[PDB]
Structure formats: structure tokens, C-alpha cells
């Protein structure tokens, strides 16, 4: 089973939030240059998550996609506040391979199908943010602010039924902690769907990626371990290949 290593870049007003530690770059806070670097050193795909204001957001994301497409050959996903078909369509047409939708998909699950009918299921990444609440995995929207009362188990099944192509599964319980991927959550979701699962949140060291792939993740997404150079992408891939993980070398 082929596995993917994906870098996540949080972006705002066209800048990498909290930048990176790559002194070899002209602008270590330029997401286009940083993304290009990652593609040259072995990252398999990129994910850009935009948290721009709201007034310049739409134009800022379309500019990002245009500049990224000029410079990067590997697939990339854009997400963050994509609320309808026309917004998703413009971003894909401007150059993005995939869009990530979360809040708007929960509030209008037909949006999944709408984008998929024009761009294919493979262009639709449904980002699911989940957290343990009173012993159940619950789905959260609005960057973790709202417990929807929807069970992770039910939403995963519905997401596939609606025609999504991939699930970007973020554990709120682990995101940012460097303590490891939420392998219990990944293993909970794995038998419920045939879709590729991108594991997200908690990456701290190379062994965490092995654990995530054993749990059934098809891809492992991380941000700070890469930006702050705590894990080298090539060393990570050689480590994973050494222990039987089918990564692309």
C-alpha cells in the first residue's frame, strides 16, 4: 500500500504563519518558495490552509494558487473557508488539484457531490476535525469552535456516500502537541471507509509516521516538524522504507 508524506502550510495574507527555519531560502516565510523547496526535497503533496481576514481572503487564495501552480509540479490542495461550488471551482481552475472543505460540507453535504460532479471525487478532500467528547468521537466545525453533535462514525460514512475522494482526518486531541498521531482515531475510521485517509495532527518524530501508517492512514500530514526542521523529509522516507512502509523514494 503506497503511502504519502504531505506538508501542510498555514497561510495568512500570503505569508507562512510562523515561517520556517530554512536559511537557504530568499524568504523563508514565502509559501510558494517554501512549497517549491519541499517538492524538491521529497514531499509528495502540499496542503495550503488559509486563514486570511475575510475581505481579501478570496483574492488572496486565488493568487496563492496561481503562484503555486507556476512553480510546483506535485499535487496540492487548498482549503480554508471554501463555502460553495463557485469558490471551489475558481480555485481548482486557477491551478489547485484538490480543495479541502469542512464546515461548509457539514452544513451542506450536497456541496461534496456538487464539486465532485464537475471535478471528480478525487478533487474533493473533506477535512474532518474530531475530538473525544464524553467518550465519543465528535465532529467539530469552525476551526474547532463548534461541536456539531455529529458522530465521527456517521459523518465518515456520509462523506463517502456523498462522493468525496479523500478524508483529511485531524485529531483536535493531538493537533500541535508533537505527542504522536491519534492512532486510536485513525483505527476507528479505517474500517468505516474505502477512501484514502490523510492523518493529521500530533506529528513529533519519525516513529509517529510509522505508527500512523500501521493504523491505516494512507498519507501523513505535518506542518511544524518540517518547517522547524525537526524531521528531515528524506531521512523520514528512508526510515519508513527501512521498516516496511511503501513510500516513494
Curated annotation (Swiss-Prot):
Changing residue 182 to N does what?
A: No change in activity
Which Gene Ontology molecular-function terms are recorded? imidazoleglycerol-phosphate synthase activity; lyase activity
Q: Which GO terms describe its biological process?
A: L-histidine biosynthetic process
Q: Which domain of life is it from?
A: Bacteria
The entry's stated outcome for residue 102 to A is: No change in activity
Gene name of the encoded protein: hisF
Quote the protein name from its UniProt record: Imidazole glycerol phosphate synthase subunit HisF
Enzyme Commission numbers on file:
4.3.2.10
Q: Where in the cell is it found?
A: Cytoplasm
Q: Describe, as the record does, how this protein assembles with itself and its partners.
A: Heterodimer of HisH and HisF.
Main location as per UniProt: cytoplasm
> Which reactions fall under this protein's catalytic activity?
5-[(5-phospho-1-deoxy-D-ribulos-1-ylimino)methylamino]-1-(5-phospho-beta-D-ribosyl)imidazole-4-carboxamide + L-glutamine = D-erythro-1-(imidazol-4-yl)glycerol 3-phosphate + 5-amino-1-(5-phospho-beta-D-ribosyl)imidazole-4-carboxamide + L-glutamate + H(+)
The record's section on Pfam families has:
His_biosynth
The entry's cellular-component GO terms read: cytoplasm
Which family does the UniProt entry place this protein in? Belongs to the HisA/HisF family.
Q: What is the effect of changing residue 18 to S?
A: Decrease in activity
Give the active-site positions. 10, 129
Q: What class of enzyme is it?
A: lyase
> Per UniProt, which keywords does this protein have?
Amino-acid biosynthesis, Cytoplasm, Histidine biosynthesis, Lyase
Functionally, this protein is described as follows:
IGPS catalyzes the conversion of PRFAR and glutamine to IGP, AICAR and glutamate. The HisF subunit catalyzes the cyclization activity that produces IGP and AICAR from PRFAR using the ammonia provided by the HisH subunit.
Q: In which pathway does it act?
A: Amino-acid biosynthesis; L-histidine biosynthesis; L-histidine from 5-phospho-alpha-D-ribose 1-diphosphate: step 5/9
Q: Which residues form the signal peptide?
A: none
Amino acid at each position: 500500500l503506497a503511502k504519502r508524506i504531505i506538508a501542510s502550510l498555514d497561510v495568512k495574507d500570503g505569508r507562512v504563519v510562523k515561517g520556517s527555519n530554512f536559511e537557504n531560502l530568499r524568504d523563508s516565510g514565502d509559501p510558494v518558495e517554501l512549497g517549491k523547496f519541499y517538492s524538491e526535497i521529497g514531499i509528495d503533496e502540499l496542503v495550503f490552509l488559509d486563514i486570511t481576514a475575510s475581505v481579501e481572503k478570496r483574492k488572496t487564495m486565488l493568487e496563492l494558487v496561481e503562484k503555486v501552480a507556476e512553480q510546483i509540479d506535485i499535487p496540492f490542495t487548498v482549503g480554508g473557508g471554501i463555502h460553495d461550488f463557485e469558490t471551489a471551482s475558481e480555485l481548482i481552475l486557477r491551478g489547485a488539484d484538490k480543495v479541502s472543505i469542512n464546515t461548509a460540507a457539514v452544513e451542506n453535504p450536497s456541496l461534496i457531490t456538487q464539486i465532485a460532479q464537475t471535478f471528480g471525487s478525487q478533487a474533493v478532500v473533506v477535512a474532518i476535525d474530531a475530538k473525544r467528547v464524553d467518550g465519543e468521537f465528535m465532529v467539530f466545525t469552525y476551526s474547532g469552535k463548534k461541536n456539531t453533535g455529529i458522530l465521527l462514525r456517521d459523518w465518515v460514512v456520509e462523506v463517502e456516500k456523498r462522493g468525496a475522494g479523500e478524508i483529511l482526518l485531524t485529531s483536535i486531541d493531538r493537533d500541535g502537541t508533537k505527542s504522536g498521531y491519534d492512532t486510536e482515531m485513525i483505527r476507528f475510521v479505517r474500517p468505516l471507509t474505502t477512501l484514502p485517509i490523510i492523518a493529521s495532527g500530533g506529528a513529533g518524530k519519525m516513529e509517529h509516521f510509522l505508527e500512523a501508517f500501521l493504523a491505516g492512514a494512507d498519507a501523513a500530514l505535518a506542518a511544524s516538524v518540517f518547517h522547524f526542521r525537526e524531521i528531515d523529509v528524506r531521512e523520514l522516507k528512508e526510515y519508513l522504507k527501512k521498516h516496511g512502509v511503501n513510500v516513494r523514494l
